[PDB]
Amino acid sequence: ASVATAYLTLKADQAQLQLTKDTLGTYQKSFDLTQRSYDVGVASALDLRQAQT
């Protein structure tokens, strides 16, 4: 029972790791667009600091 629960938590936690890597990708793309709109001048620096947080 303990080896089975360890393997199931290992598979589920590396799936969780993959989904957090994908959310990191989407947040990085959103900060890339906010830094792009900050250079041009549409977005103020408050939206840039919110995307950076």
Partner: protein
């Protein structure tokens, strides 16, 4: 310090310039009602008196 955008600074500058234009037109109508001499010269008599 870029704490607001350059775009809604251009919007606020536009609202400022348009309201200056409105004050300028109201000041044109207020520099009327005291009918200045259009050219310098010798003036005749008032065909339209006080009160009319």
């Amino acid at each position: 310090d870029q704490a607001v955008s350059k775009q809604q600074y251009a919007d606020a500058n536009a609202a400022y310039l348009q309201s200056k234009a409105a004050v300028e037109q109201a000041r044109i109508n207020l520099r009327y009602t005291k009918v200045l001499s259009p050219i310098s010269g010798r003036i005749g008599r008032s065909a339209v008196t006080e009160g009319a």
